[PDB]
Design a protein around this ligand. Structure first.
Ligand SMILES: [Ca+2]
Ligand SMILES: [Ca+2]
Ligand SMILES: [Ca+2]
Ligand SMILES: [Ca+2]
Ligand SMILES: [Ca+2]
Ligand SMILES: [Ca+2]
Lengths: 542, 475, 544, 481
């Protein structure tokens, strides 16, 4: 794929001269939902990436989008030269361009923020206060892209998705055109992760947003009211709200004395098959599917059991009907784990955790919970936790590699992630690459695999899913990838002993994230690197 | 189970032909219906079960009475009766206590749909005085041999079929929504072979596993939910595997998106078997069987399929197949018993069936609740859950089936309360490592003559379906 | 004054039988600003208390209030029997009653939340999951006030100002009618401090609020961008940003409870040349009133010759922020603990606040200037501020009816006054008593006596840096000729002499149960073991 | 400072009566006069014109406002010479303020022409006039021709020591908005202020005076004696012979917003010391609604007091107060005892932005007094901008006359600029000389060697009480750029 280029490099290479690089110039605030059209010229990877960007907006703001219906104003997405947009609505159909390199989540989010009404962060009048502009290092004629002019009463943000990178319109790669007056920020400006917390604040103050479209419930256990959860009465005992005073919480990891709370069910005493029930408050879903994400730990007997249940409506408006959803079992890990459970609730319901004592005569520990989130989105297909990443990074040379355990999609395709901690082609970067694995389904499946989107995402472990800045990369499997890479691994795959399976050649972004960035933004919380991977058919957008 | 003529005689009624109230005349579907508050919750659940049978075997449909010129209201005021024919005005149907059995309910509804009795030799000298007019002239709709009878030693009508209470006969259905597909058979590496009687369960489809490479394979709605039923056999390696897949629409009108639904793994029972798979398809789709070779050298047989059906109904919560039932019925004295495996419902209650092949001249089934790993999250005593026990008619076409069924609702009135948490009221059995409740059921569930009568004992297998569902929402 | 009564007791004493104790049941959301009328029957203390409640709404939400002027829907405040309101926007007229005894901040805030559209927390459909109703302990014929009657995806709030106290409609004072299922919350339910965080979240979701009318700036320094502040270029050095991990350093935001987190600004005075300085400066701020209060925490361990100067830079009338004006000077002294400062600004045009540090004699200084927890609000600064050191040790070492007295403060007119604190209240076991008194001073000959129609507002500062999440306890009264033992005549006549001020103090008047000890220990009121009290004393004759 | 006739002669101009432009029924202005300050007009000249307009508003009903497109507007520009068109032309008309015309009395002259006036010139030493110019003599006043105007030989006047003054308007020039209150006293508390008639030796008025005695009664006994702009200056003369513990407090009572004036705000406190002479006080008021000023006298120690508090000559103007004030006692003795180049230095004064400054006085400059401004290092220096530029120095010798119509205060103005070198206005610790009296560096003095003549001081009331009172102002005018 190659290193992701900045929008200013793309539009310069495309021979454009729009105002401020990506802004085109031919009462101006939208009324939600914004009508959209994905045009036929727009490539399949770009269509998929645009719909992934819309899910981020719904998870983090009140912004929403719909297919066209004969409405007054609308956004048409097309594959023209360069990445560009027209700032604010303009009352008859406006056009966003995404083409020949623009198909990245953060670049599409950027072009949509222009259409919502935002200008560049560095375009504000008070740039001369926060950043230096090296005018002698800007390319000839392109100085006009650094001119200024709108009072939402908010501070200047170096993390803003709407900021230029240190090397924008730059005549020699050795010397940046922009530098921060606070030196720590020189490696922050022009990030391509996600919306900053100040970007979401400004979007919400401009559009009177007070709630998001796809977040139902969120609980870190840090308030004594336990987020309005309730304890069972028909069960033998109760969950204790503990305060981190030989264990640490996942919200703060014991870095704070007193602060830091988690729920515990002690398995070291009492009768076998005694249980404790923790239940949510009544929730009202707005989609057919939800993902319950939580962090848990087990140290007791292997026979101890954390079961996830739903109690849903009886169709008469009484929340009485139980259903058993997933079971987690005790083992030898003894560290905090991430769990995902797919719910499918179409009517009002509650989520319940049932801890149960398996062998209390041979247990000296228990079950722990922290950091719950419920979203109205699909759950990540594969999740890979690399323990002790800092030590992995210090013990590996350039071009040493780790491989995930084998994973499987809904159709039954097998796949995995290869991690190189010290990237061969990019010194000081981590390289992630995607490979297909042979499996028990290879005869019912189609080959070569095509039109499936791969989404790889490094999780920012921030407890509030709104403020997470997770790094993501996306691609679509195509016959144009040759060495065809995606043919049945049996014919061309390099055999591996650890799965008794054939792995395809791996085609992945050489620079996924810098080592410097990995250190910050809670990505390596607990020194665990957490990678999400999705592999899904997008042929229906064609 | 008492007869309708007995129930109405015991109620002290004197209706036309024993169960008709005499106060064009054909319905327009769906029939608008209202369930009265007086009507029992157990009766309401049984009435819904009867409605499902009507939709499955006939065009007849039932809808809530939001507004219509004519409709049916079900009452428990006095005995069991139904005015014959649509009255052009809202009519009335009575479901007497002791007549909640599904058969009795289907009978009353057949009168509302317009039927008179099938009999309408008669021994007039054996009839009760003052009831001879119920035998005047002018199947589920026939009198029993001892209807209005004065002396149990002699019948009023002459035999063993008449006044059956299984289901609609094929003639009752001929004289009168939820079936999608049915078949008796009469990109992948290899094909399934269509083969002839290695005897058919009804022709059958065979995928051979005795040759070639490992992991070679062969491939063969109006509501929200469906049940796929099929018969299968495996004789190859225990490594061999039958997989059930759905291919569904991607919403562009293209059935392409695969989803894996169930896997069946080879095992040492080499007989034919019955499987149920729940499909949850809300758009157009296909069901696919993937056969796959697990270890060809070790394998000396194949995978076989026969008697497929797909219905828009919930799959049975547990299924038990008692093998060599003729030999079981011979090998058991009165009060010898068999117990099913430990099944579970959606709420996680554990349960089973106890069978006593010699009850006199009847088989006896009884339901019991087993302790399970969910006993702490569950509610006790269990109430307002309906139990359905059914003996399957193995007839492959679901329209033609006359499956025996019985029903009851768990209630604090059942004492010896039988339904409290089994660890406190029940007794420990080593064979499940579990506590079993007292067993409650019917001493007369089916006659030994009946099991022989309608191919229930095909392959000498007896197949029992059991369901245990919360019906509190009807209250 | 006595103990503050609950709204249920006040209406029950008035013999009323309203819906849910305080609702009158004669598109239903308001359009801001809400038109209001303060009726002629409404007493002077109630008028002053209602205007004080409107300033809380403008600090914590987008709610705002304006004069009648002939609009179709308006709130009329009147002095009928009981404390009660209608619910929502009638669109014709709405009466809210601030009866006798209703004139306390949190009661007026409650009635205004009813008019904004809120019902009680203990009447929700899910309630029976979260609290127990002891039906045998309710008074005969009042059980309808605990019946169940709006879904915003918000959880059940025990802290809600809209929740009933444990003894509401109770037949026996020893047994509660309500108890929380989570047992810690039994002393939280029915609090009368302020809006909870969840109360404000629900108010803001229901009205599409994203900002507040009277907050201009806030900064705790916990983000490395220093909340949009900038360093000076014309000065001699820079302010550092320090992490509280070093021995002998501690941030005011988290007080080292967290480790590897907690930040403050430092200017070192332990080296360099005399009269070197450093500037730290705000973003460009746009005021919407004539007056502002800058509140910040500071500490000075350096030479008593070191100086912290607050400056403003304001617009020159060309639209360029260039004109400097000097505002306040703070000097080094021997109290090395954290201190609270308040500086009044009077800016009518866009401006920037600046802190200048200055090194005086670094030859003999081993310390420096420290800053944390800045806030700027469009409200008048507190007239007097009293910090009681080691309060937990004071509370343990004092007996019942021992006392402490504040320094002597002055109001704008020049009246001298102070606060008397009794840590272990005589009349209210487990409470702290605060009481006001007037002190003789150098202005007693120009001032009017007996002092009447002035309003006293006493507040205990919650110390939470983000002003939207403070739950400060506040109490109010108006000086009146009825107060006799007249208490408010010139202190040299009616007072007693005190050797500590060489002055005369009036008889002290206030609330014996000002706050419970359990409440002070729960929230940030005793942060660092400093208790911070604010007091105000202003003329409200113009509301008459 | 040169005369206007010399400035227009140096420009080589030949205008009607030397400074009137004639462009060709009855014409006369209707106030306020609309005006424009042109972009070509230098920064010192813009500031000097605005100081001249405050004199018009302080002394007359004349007023000035910005352009609104009416038929008549006056545009001020930097052409050659100082000149004007007499009276309203009924169209836009121009005033020229050339190089050297920035002095207030020259601007006041050109404006008097714009209002409509002619010189008092009337039927002169013809043999002393420059060849050809004789027509400019055809037929205290500011407009009166200077004695040496249109003169061929500096040894002899053409036209005695009063004529052609450049102080201010005479009373007669005013005879041909910003004063609120004025009193010379000549026409809840414990006791009263005594109106007193100067009948006791050693107790004489500054002009009758108001007296609060401190030699009897109890301590802390008191007596009380009780707008079109946002800001006002209360000027008064006071004296305090009593205890150093005695106080004079200035208080304001303002409208409470019901229309009743009851609220009291403490404004300034003045404290007794061992200077028993009359002092001049300035108190800034900031009143936007109706109000009363109050003086509270208070007895500090009646057991160690043999005197009192005295007040005289109150005035209240809707203008900023003077930034710094200096009172040179016994000037007549100073002027006799000093030689050429002996000096006195003012106490350090601070503007609103915090720049430290002062004045140097040389009493014998020949026969003139020399005043010069300097910047002093102070506690703010690190935070201030340097070199200081675009701040306007005004130095004024107050004519002590209590009625503000009758004052003729000598005033000079300049604007700090990088062009001033010997840059004089850089930070005094870099470019100045250190002094032990202030413990501070002082920048090089810049000012006028001929600020006023010793003759002019005697004629006016500047030397009342043998006090010379100097006012100084140092304010940012960058916004006029
Ligand atoms: Ca936690
Ligand atoms: Ca067959
Ligand atoms: Ca801090
Ligand atoms: Ca600096
Ligand atoms: Ca008096
Ligand atoms: Ca006088």
């Amino acid at each position: 794929f190659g290193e992701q280029k900045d929008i200013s490099e793309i539009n310069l290479a495309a021979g454009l001269d729009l105002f401020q690089g990506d802004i085109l110039l031919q009462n101006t605030r939208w009324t939600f939902p914004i009508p959209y059209i994905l045009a036929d010229n727009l490539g399949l990877n770009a269509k998929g990436a645009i719909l992934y960007a819309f899910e981020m907006f719904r998870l983090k703001s009140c912004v929403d989008f719909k297919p066209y219906e004969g409405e007054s104003s609308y956004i048409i997405f097309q594959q023209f030269d360069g990445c560009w947009s027209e700032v604010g609505d303009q009352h008859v159909g406006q056009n966003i361009s995404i083409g020949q390199g623009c198909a990245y989540k953060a670049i599409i989010e950027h072009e949509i923020l222009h259409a919502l009404g935002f200008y560049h962060e560095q375009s504000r009048t008070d740039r001369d206060d926060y950043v230096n502009i090296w005018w002698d290092q800007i390319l000839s004629g392109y100085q006009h892209n650094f001119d200024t002019y709108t009072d939402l009463n908010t501070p200047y943000d170096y993390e803003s998705l709407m900021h230029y990178q240190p090397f924008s319109f730059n005549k020699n790669a050795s010397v940046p055109t922009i530098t921060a007056k606070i030196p720590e920020f020189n490696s922050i400006i022009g990030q391509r992760l996600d919306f900053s917390a100040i970007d979401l604040e400004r979007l919400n103050r401009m559009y009177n947003c007070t709630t998001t479209h796809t977040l139902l419930d969120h609980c870190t256990f840090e308030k004594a009211n336990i987020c309005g959860m309730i304890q069972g009465t028909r069960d033998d005992t109760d969950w204790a709200h503990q305060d981190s005073a030989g264990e640490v919480d996942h919200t703060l990891l014991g870095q704070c004395t007193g602060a830091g709370y988690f729920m515990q069910f002690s398995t070291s005493s009492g009768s076998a098959e005694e249980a404790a029930l923790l239940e949510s408050r009544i929730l009202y879903p707005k989609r057919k599917q939800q993902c319950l994400q939580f962090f848990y730990k087990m140290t007791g007997s292997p026979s101890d059991r954390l079961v996830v249940w739903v109690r849903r409506d009886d169709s008469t408006g009484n929340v009485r009907k139980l259903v058993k959803v997933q079971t987690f079992q005790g083992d030898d890990d003894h560290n905090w784990k991430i769990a995902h459970v797919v719910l499918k609730e179409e009517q009002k319901f509650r989520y319940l955790f049932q801890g149960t004592k398996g062998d209390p005569q041979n247990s000296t520990g228990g079950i722990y919970l922290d950091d719950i989130t419920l979203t109205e989105t699909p759950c990540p297909t594969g999740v890979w936790t690399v323990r002790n990443f800092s030590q992995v990074l210090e013990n590996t040379s350039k071009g040493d590699k780790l491989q995930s355990p084998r994973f499987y999609n809904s159709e039954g395709y097998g796949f995995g992630v290869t991690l190189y901690p010290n990237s061969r082609e990019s010194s000081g970067y981590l390289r992630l690459a995607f490979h297909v694995c042979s499996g028990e389904n290879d005869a019912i499946l189609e080959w070569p695999v095509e039109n499936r989107q791969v989404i790889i995402t490094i999780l920012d472990q921030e407890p509030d899913v709104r403020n997470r800045m997770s790094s993501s990369m996306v691609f679509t499997t195509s016959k144009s990838h040759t060495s065809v890479i995606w043919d049945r691994p049996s014919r061309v795959g390099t055999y591996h002993t650890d799965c008794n399976c054939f792995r395809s050649i791996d085609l992945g972004w050489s620079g996924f994230i810098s080592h410097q960035m990995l250190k910050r933004r809670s990505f390596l919380k607990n020194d665990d690197l957490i990678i999400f991977v999705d592999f899904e058919d997008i042929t229906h957008l064609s």
